[PDB]
Design a protein around this ligand. Structure first.
Ligand code: UQG
Ligand code: NA
Lengths: 49, 233
C-alpha cells in the first residue's frame, strides 16, 4: 500500500507500490521477493555453512 | 578484529586482503570482477596486490585469486595532508577480472537512500585479517564481528578528534570487541533478508577495543554514485 510502512512489503527496494531488486536479482512471482537471476549474485553466501 | 570469530570458508566472499611491502596491511571489498572498494589511507605509486577467496593467509586453500592493481582512484575530496581519515574511500582496478564463484562474490551496493536505511538498521558485520589484540599480530584466519551502530552524540563525546557527518561509530560501550589496524578498507555490511549490502568502509579508531572508544567507519551512502560511476563495466 505505501513504502513508508514496512517498505511496502518489498524484500529490497520500494517506489510509490512497485518492488525492485539489486543487480543480479529478479523480482519473484509474488512481486515482493527477490531471487537470483545469475549464478553468483552479490551479497550471498553459497558455500555450505 | 579484536574479540571476533574465525570466518568459515566462503562466509564473506566479498572480502579481499591487500598486500604491499607488508602483507595484510588493509582489506577491501569486491564491487565487481574488476574493482575493489577500500580506504584511501591504505593506498597511493606503491605497488599493491589484491587476494580474493582468501581464508587462512598462511595456507594455500586453492580458492585464492591474486591480482595486480593497475589503477588507484582515491575519492577527489580525499587529501591526506589535511585529514588522513576524512573522505576515506578509494577504488582499485584489477589487471585481469576475478572469476566469480562461491569464494569470490561481489558485495551488493544499494542506492544512496537505501544504503542509509540499511546502516540505520543498527547492526553490521565487519571482517578482516587485522590485529586480534591491541598492539598484537594480524590474524591467520579471516575474522568477523557483529558491531552495533552508536548514536552520533555518544560518538562525539568519546573523542577529541573530529567525527564528520559521513563517518559513523560502531562498537560496544565496554570495548572488548572491535575492528583494528590491518582491517581498514574492509567491509561493514548489513544483512537484508539474506542479502548483504555494503553500508560502511572500515576506517580508523584510537587504539582498538578500549572502553569509551569506538570504531570509525566511512558511510558508503555518501559515495554510492561515485562508486557506481567509476566501476561501470
Ligand atoms: C598504508 C597504511 C597507513 C596507515 C595505516 C593505519 N595506521 C593506523 N591505524 C590504522 N587503522 C585502524 C585503527 C583502529 C581501528 C579501530 N579501532 N576500529 C581500525 C583501523 C591504519 O589503517 C594502515 C595502512
Ligand atoms: Na589461504
Amino acid at each position: 500500500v505505501t513504502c513508508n510502512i514496512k517498505n511496502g512489503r518489498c524484500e529490497q527496494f520500494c517506489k510509490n507500490v512497485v518492488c525492485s531488486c539489486t543487480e543480479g536479482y529478479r523480482l519473484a512471482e509474488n512481486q515482493k521477493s527477490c531471487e537470483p537471476a545469475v549464478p553468483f549474485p552479490c551479497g550471498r553466501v553459497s558455500v555450505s555453512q | 578484529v579484536v574479540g571476533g570469530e574465525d570466518a568459515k570458508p566462503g562466509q564473506f566472499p566479498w572480502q579481499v586482503v591487500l598486500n604491499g611491502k607488508v602483507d595484510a596491511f588493509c582489506g577491501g571489498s569486491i564491487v565487481n570482477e574488476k574493482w575493489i572498494v577500500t580506504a584511501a589511507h591504505c593506498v597511493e605509486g606503491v605497488k599493491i596486490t589484491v587476494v580474493a577467496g582468501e581464508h587462512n593467509i598462511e595456507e594455500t586453500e586453492h580458492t585464492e585469486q591474486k591480482r595486480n592493481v593497475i589503477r588507484i582512484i582515491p575519492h577527489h575530496n580525499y587529501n591526506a595532508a589535511i585529514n588522513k581519515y576524512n573522505h576515506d574511500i578509494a577504488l582499485l582496478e584489477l589487471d585481469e577480472p576475478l572469476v566469480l564463484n562461491s569464494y569470490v562474490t561481489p558485495i551488493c551496493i544499494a542506492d544512496k537512500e537505501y544504503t542509509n536505511i540499511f546502516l540505520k538498521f543498527g547492526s553490521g558485520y565487519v571482517s578482516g585479517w587485522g590485529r586480534v589484540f591491541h598492539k598484537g599480530r594480524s590474524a591467520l584466519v579471516l575474522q568477523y564481528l557483529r558491531v552495533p551502530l552508536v548514536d552520533r552524540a555518544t560518538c562525539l563525546r568519546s573523542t577529541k578528534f573530529t567525527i564528520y557527518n559521513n563517518m559513523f561509530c560502531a562498537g560496544f560501550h565496554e570495548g572488548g570487541r572491535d575492528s583494528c589496524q590491518g582491517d581498514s578498507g574492509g567491509p561493514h555490511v548489513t544483512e537484508v533478508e539474506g542479502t548483504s549490502f555494503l553500508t560502511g568502509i572500515i576506517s580508523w579508531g584510537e587504539e582498538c577495543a578500549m572502553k569509551g572508544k569506538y570504531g570509525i567507519y566511512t558511510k558508503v551512502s555518501r559515495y554510492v554514485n561515485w562508486i557506481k560511476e567509476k566501476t561501470k563495466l
